[PDB]
C-alpha cells in the first residue's frame, strides 16, 4: 500500500512534529523555564526554516543553470 504509506507518512508529519507538551506540572518557575525553552525551540525552528528556504532557492538557481547548460549543449 504505497498510498497507505503516503497517508501514514503525512499523519506522522502532523503527529510527530507535534510534541508531548508538559507545562501544567512545571510550576510557575518551571513554567517560565519551559516558556524560555519553547521560545528557543521555535526561534531555532524559524532559523532552520529560513535557512532551508534560502538553500532551496539556491538549489533551484543551480537547477536552472544546469538545465540551461543542457539546453545550450542540446
Amino acid at each position: 500500500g504505497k498510498r497507505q504509506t503516503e497517508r501514514e507518512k503525512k499523519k506522522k508529519i502532523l503527529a510527530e512534529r507535534r510534541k508531548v507538551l508538559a507545562i501544567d506540572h512545571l510550576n510557575e518557575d518551571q513554567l517560565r523555564e519551559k516558556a524560555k525553552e519553547l521560545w528557543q525551540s521555535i526561534y531555532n525552528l524559524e532559523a532552520e526554516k529560513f535557512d532551508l528556504q534560502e538553500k532551496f532557492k539556491q538549489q533551484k538557481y543551480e537547477i536552472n543553470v544546469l538545465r540551461n547548460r543542457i539546453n545550450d549543449n542540446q
Binding site: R32, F50, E54
Partner: protein
Amino acid sequence: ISASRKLQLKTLMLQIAKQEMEREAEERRGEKGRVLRTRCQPLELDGLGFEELQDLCRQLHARVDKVDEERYDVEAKVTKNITEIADLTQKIYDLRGKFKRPTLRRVRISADAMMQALLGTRAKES
C-alpha cells in the same frame, strides 16, 4: 595582454567574482538574521503568574508544531531540488563525459621525473 597576462586577467576576474560572492553571502546572512529577529522576538519572562505562562507555553507548542511541519515541507522541497540538480548534472556528464577518455600513457613520464629516471638526480626544476 599576453597569454599569461590574460590568464591573470581572468584570474582577477575570478577574484572579483569571489569578492562579490563573499559579500553576497555576508549580506544574505546579515539580512536573514535581521528577518529572523523580526520573527524570533524574545518575550518578557518575569511578571507572569502560572496560568498566563501555561497559556503562552500552549501557544508556543502550537507554533513549534506549525513551524516544524513547515520545515518538513521546505526540507522536502530541498530534497526534490537535490534530486533534480543531481539528475541535471548527471545529464551534463552524459553529454560531455564518458567518451572524454584521455590517452593514459605510462611512458610519458613527467619532464623532471623523466629526466631524473634517465639521468639520475639531474632534474630538479619541474
